[PDB]
Amino acid sequence: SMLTELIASNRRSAAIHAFVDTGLSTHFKDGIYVDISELSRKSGVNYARFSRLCDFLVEMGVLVSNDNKFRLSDECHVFANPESFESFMIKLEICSHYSNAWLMYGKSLFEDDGKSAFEMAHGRPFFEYLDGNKFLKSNFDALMTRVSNLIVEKLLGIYDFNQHNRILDVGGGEGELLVRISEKVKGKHYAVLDRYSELPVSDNIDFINGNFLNSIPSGYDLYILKNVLNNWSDSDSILILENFRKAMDKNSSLLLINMVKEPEFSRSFDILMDVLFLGKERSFTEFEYLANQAGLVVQETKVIDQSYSPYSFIKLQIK
Amino acid sequence: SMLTELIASNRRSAAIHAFVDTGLSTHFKDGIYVDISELSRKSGVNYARFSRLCDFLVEMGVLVSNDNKFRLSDECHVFANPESFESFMIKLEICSHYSNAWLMYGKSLFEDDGKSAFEMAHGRPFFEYLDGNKFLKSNFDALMTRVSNLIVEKLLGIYDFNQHNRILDVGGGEGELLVRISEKVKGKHYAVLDRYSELPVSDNIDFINGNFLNSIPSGYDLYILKNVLNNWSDSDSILILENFRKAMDKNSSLLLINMVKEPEFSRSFDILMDVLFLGKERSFTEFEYLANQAGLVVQETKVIDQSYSPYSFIKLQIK
Ligand SMILES: Nc1ncnc2c1ncn2[C@@H]1O[C@H](CSCC[C@H](N)C(=O)O)[C@@H](O)[C@H]1O
Ligand SMILES: Nc1ncnc2c1ncn2[C@@H]1O[C@H](CSCC[C@H](N)C(=O)O)[C@@H](O)[C@H]1O
Ligand SMILES: O=C1c2cccc(O)c2C(=O)c2c(O)cc(O)cc21
Ligand SMILES: O=C1c2cccc(O)c2C(=O)c2c(O)cc(O)cc21
Ligand code: NA
Resolution value (Å, 1 decimal) = 2.0
Helix (H, G, I), strand (E, B) or coil at A312: strand
Burial category of B202 from C-beta neighbours within 10 Å (exposed 0-12, middle 13-18, buried 19 and up) = middle
Residue A7 lies in a domain: yes
Q: What's the CATH code of the domain at A233?
A: 3.40.50.150
Report the distance separating Cα B39 and Cα A5, nearest Å. 29
Separation CA A27–CA B112 (nearest Å): 21
What whole-number distance in Å separates Cα of residue B208 and Cα of residue B221? 17
Instruction: Return the amino acid letter for B280.
Output: K
Report yes or no on A121 lying in a domain: no
Strand, helix or coil for residue A232: coil
Give rounded-to-5 percent helix, strand, coil for chain A.
50, 20, 35
The answer to whether the CB atoms of B8 and A268 lie below 8 A apart is yes
Residue nearest (by alpha carbon) to ligand 4 atom 14:
B273
Cα–Cα distance between A55 and B157 in angstroms, integer?
Answer: 35
My answer on whether A32 and A164 are in the same domain is no
Whether residue A218 is contained in a domain is answered as: yes
3-state secondary structure of A301: strand
Q: Which of A82, A108, A132 is the last residue of a domain?
A: A82
Q: Do residues A175 and A268 share a domain?
A: yes
Given a contact cutoff of 8 angstroms between Cβ atoms, the answer to whether A282 and A273 are in contact is no
- DSSP annotation string for A69-136: EEEE-GGGGGGG-TTSHHHHHHHHHTSHHHHHHHTTHHHHTT--SS--HHHHHHSS-HHHHHTT-HHH
Residue of B16, B130, B227 to test ligand 4 pocket, by largest number of atoms within 8 Å of CB: B227
Are B62 and B187 in a shared domain?
Answer: no
Residues in chain A: 319
Looking at the domain assignment, is residue A130 inside a domain? no
Closest by Cβ to B21, choosing from A4, A100, A106: A106
From the list A131, A140, A56, the residue with the least C-alpha distance to A98 is A140
Handedness of CA A35, B289, B218, B172 (dihedral sign): positive
A212-239 b/e (C-beta count within 10 Å ≥ 16 → b): beeebeeebbbbbbbbbbbbbebebbbe
Is residue A51 domain-shared with residue A156, that is, in the same domain?
A: no
- Beta bridge partners, A226, equal A257
At position A67, the amino acid (one-letter code) is D
Test the B interface: residue of A2, A3, A63 with most B CBs within 10 Å:
A3
Closest CB from B9, B53, B275 relative to A13:
B9
- Would residue B100 count as lying in a domain? no
Q: Which residue, B62, B80, B98, sits at the end of a domain?
A: B80
Displacement of CA B208 from its chain's centroid (Å): 21
Residue among A89, A195, A277, A312 to mutate when testing ligand 1 (max atoms within 8 A of CB): A195
Residues of chain A positioned with their CB less than 8 A from the CB of B17: 102-103, 105-106
A11 HSE (CA, 13 A, CB side): 26
Residue A202 lies in a domain: yes
How many domains does chain B divide into? 2
Domain for residue B24, yes or no?
yes
**Same domain for A302 and A188:** yes
A157 and A71, same domain (yes or no): no
What is the DSSP code (8-state) at residue A34?
B
Same domain, A165 and A305: yes
Instruction: Using CB atoms, pick whichever of A13, A18, A267 lies closest to residue B106.
Output: A18
The DSSP bridge partners found for residue B34 are B70
Among B83, B104, B99, which Cα is nearest to B13's? B99
For residue A257, the Cα-to-chain-centroid distance in whole angstroms is 12
Task: Say if residue A170 is in the same domain as residue A303.
Answer: yes
Please give the DSSP secondary-structure letter assigned to residue A258.
E
Tell me whether residue A267 is in a domain. Answer: yes
Same domain, A156 and A295: yes
Domain that holds residue A57: 2-82
The secondary structure of chain B as a DSSP string is -HHHHHHTTHHHHHHHHHHHHTTGGGGSGGG--B-HHHHHHHH---HHHHHHHHHHHHHHTSEEEETTEEEE-GGGGGGG-TTSHHHHHHHHHTSHHHHHHHTTHHHHTT--S---HHHHHHSS-HHHHHTT-HHHHHHHHHHHHHHHHHHHHHHHHHS--TT-SEEEEET-TT-HHHHHHHHHS-SSEEEEEE--SS----TT-EEEE--TTT---S--SEEEEES-GGGS-HHHHHHHHHHHHHH--TT-EEEEEEE---TTS-SHHHHHHHHHHS-----HHHHHHHHHHHTEEEEEEEEEE-SS-EEEEEEEEE-
Q: Identify residues after which chain A is interrupted (C–N over 2.5 A).
A: none
Residues with CB under 6 A from ligand 2: B 127, 144, 147-148, 171-173, 194-195, 210-213, 226-228, 231
Q: How far is CA B65 from CA A25, A198, B36, B51, in A?
A: 41, 50, 11, 11
Same structural domain, B71 and B157: no
CA dist B78 and B86 (Å) reads: 7
Query: Mutate which of A65, A100, A109 to disrupt the B interface (most B C-beta within 10 Å)?
Result: A109
Q: Are A95 and B100 in contact (CB under 8 A)?
A: no
CATH number at residue A44: 1.10.10.10
Ligand 3 binding pocket includes A89 (Cβ within 6 Å):
yes
Q: Which of chain A's residues have a Cβ under 8 Å away from the Cβ of B18?
A: 102, 105-106, 109
Domain identity same for A282 and A204: yes
**CA of B173 vs chain A CAs: smallest distance (Å):** 22
Q: How far is Cα of residue B48 from the mean position of the Cα atoms in its chain?
A: 36
Select from A60, A82, A104 the last residue of a domain.
A82
Same domain for A162 and A62, yes or no, is: no
Residue A221's SS3 state is: coil
H/E element, A237? helix A234-247
| Measured distance CA(B53)–CA(B70) in Å, rounded | 12
